[PDB]
Design an enzyme around this catalytic site. Structure first.
Site, mmCIF file in Angstrom:
data_model
loop_
_atom_site.group_PDB
_atom_site.id
_atom_site.type_symbol
_atom_site.label_atom_id
_atom_site.label_comp_id
_atom_site.label_asym_id
_atom_site.label_seq_id
_atom_site.Cartn_x
_atom_site.Cartn_y
_atom_site.Cartn_z
ATOM 1 N N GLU A 35 0.824 -1.197 0.000
ATOM 2 C CA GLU A 35 0.000 0.000 0.000
ATOM 3 C C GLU A 35 0.868 1.261 0.000
ATOM 4 O O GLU A 35 0.578 2.228 -0.716
ATOM 5 C CB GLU A 35 -0.918 0.021 1.228
ATOM 6 C CG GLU A 35 -2.066 -0.987 1.211
ATOM 7 C CD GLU A 35 -3.146 -0.661 0.184
ATOM 8 O OE1 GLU A 35 -3.052 0.396 -0.479
ATOM 9 O OE2 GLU A 35 -4.087 -1.474 0.034
ATOM 10 N N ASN A 46 -7.561 9.072 -5.649
ATOM 11 C CA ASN A 46 -8.450 8.073 -6.226
ATOM 12 C C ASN A 46 -9.269 8.755 -7.320
ATOM 13 O O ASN A 46 -9.450 9.971 -7.303
ATOM 14 C CB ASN A 46 -9.379 7.502 -5.153
ATOM 15 C CG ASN A 46 -8.617 6.814 -4.037
ATOM 16 O OD1 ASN A 46 -7.646 6.089 -4.290
ATOM 17 N ND2 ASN A 46 -9.053 7.026 -2.802
ATOM 18 N N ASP A 48 -12.347 9.026 -7.803
ATOM 19 C CA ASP A 48 -13.542 9.744 -7.365
ATOM 20 C C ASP A 48 -13.259 11.052 -6.629
ATOM 21 O O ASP A 48 -14.177 11.733 -6.179
ATOM 22 C CB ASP A 48 -14.420 8.833 -6.505
ATOM 23 C CG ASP A 48 -13.795 8.504 -5.162
ATOM 24 O OD1 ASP A 48 -12.606 8.837 -4.945
ATOM 25 O OD2 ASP A 48 -14.501 7.904 -4.318
ATOM 26 N N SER A 50 -11.346 11.303 -3.830
ATOM 27 C CA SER A 50 -10.847 11.058 -2.484
ATOM 28 C C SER A 50 -9.341 10.768 -2.576
ATOM 29 O O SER A 50 -8.784 10.620 -3.671
ATOM 30 C CB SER A 50 -11.570 9.862 -1.857
ATOM 31 O OG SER A 50 -11.309 8.677 -2.586
ATOM 32 N N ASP A 52 -5.959 8.549 -0.535
ATOM 33 C CA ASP A 52 -5.547 7.524 0.429
ATOM 34 C C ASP A 52 -4.313 8.056 1.143
ATOM 35 O O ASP A 52 -3.425 8.606 0.493
ATOM 36 C CB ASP A 52 -5.201 6.216 -0.294
ATOM 37 C CG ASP A 52 -6.432 5.502 -0.821
ATOM 38 O OD1 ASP A 52 -7.565 5.911 -0.466
ATOM 39 O OD2 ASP A 52 -6.271 4.518 -1.576
ATOM 40 N N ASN A 59 -8.533 5.838 3.216
ATOM 41 C CA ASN A 59 -9.336 6.697 2.353
ATOM 42 C C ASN A 59 -10.126 7.840 3.006
ATOM 43 O O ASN A 59 -10.864 7.638 3.968
ATOM 44 C CB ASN A 59 -10.301 5.795 1.566
ATOM 45 C CG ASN A 59 -10.845 6.455 0.314
ATOM 46 O OD1 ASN A 59 -11.085 7.657 0.286
ATOM 47 N ND2 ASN A 59 -11.067 5.657 -0.726
#
Ligand SMILES: C[C@@H](O)CN1CCN(CC(=O)O)CCN(CC(=O)O)CCN(CC(=O)O)CC1
Ligand SMILES: C[C@@H](O)CN1CCN(CC(=O)O)CCN(CC(=O)O)CCN(CC(=O)O)CC1
Ligand SMILES: [Cl-]
Ligand SMILES: [Cl-]
Ligand SMILES: [Cl-]
Ligand SMILES: [Cl-]
Ligand SMILES: [Gd]
EC number: 3.2.1.17
Length: 129
Positions: A35, A46, A48, A50, A52, A59
């Site tokens: 990650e 991301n 959309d 958002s 991380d 998120n």
């Protein structure tokens, strides 16, 4: 902060992540590796809108507030920047909430695709834990 493999394993164990919700320590170290490559300052946008954050790429859509994911939640009640600290306490406490929401570690796509079903103990092999 970029943690060493065993260094991170020890920190996660100390914060009670080992065997949390039934997931052994190697599962968490493996997830962290893919990650964030053990980098607490990792951030990734991301599609959309958002973002991380941190070692476990938590998120902003549901877990932390970054002020730029309109319509999102902050279920861990923390600014997303707190997830980038050299101290992983915030990331661990929030991860505990995520893994407890019903879908276990499948919440981390990299864990499902690169850790699930493998020899995860290998990730803590050699460490004095
Ligand atoms: C406790 C977590 O569940 C919180 N949750 C995290 C993400 N969830 C994961 C999932 O529900 O599997 C995915 C989306 N979720 C779908 C749904 O809940 O039906 C809608 C939003 N939820 C609403 C709620 O849960 O009250 C808020 C945030
Ligand atoms: C809106 C949907 O979420 C409705 N939901 C459909 C199924 N959910 C899906 C999910 O939560 O991802 C799975 C189980 N759900 C876990 C939880 O919610 O914490 C418990 C019951 N929910 C309570 C609630 O949602 O307020 C009622 C029905
Ligand atoms: Cl926001
Ligand atoms: Cl720490
Ligand atoms: Cl589970
Ligand atoms: Cl393990
Ligand atoms: Gd949910």
């Amino acid at each position: 902060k970029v943690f060493g493999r065993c260094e991170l394993a020890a920190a996660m164990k100390r914060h009670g992540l080992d065997n949390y919700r039934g997931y052994s320590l190697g599962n968490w170290v493996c997830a962290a590796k893919f990650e964030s490559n053990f980098n607490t300052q990792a951030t990734n946008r991301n599609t959309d809108g958002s973002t991380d954050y941190g070692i476990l790429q938590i998120n902003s859509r549901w877990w932390c507030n970054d002020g730029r994911t309109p319509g999102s939640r902050n279920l861990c009640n923390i600014p997303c920047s707190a997830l980038l600290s050299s101290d992983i306490t915030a990331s661990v406490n929030c991860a505990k909430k995520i893994v407890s929401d019903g879908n276990g570690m499948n919440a981390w796509v990299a864990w499902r695709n690169r850790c699930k079903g493998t020899d995860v103990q290998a990730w803590i092999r050699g460490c004095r834990l």
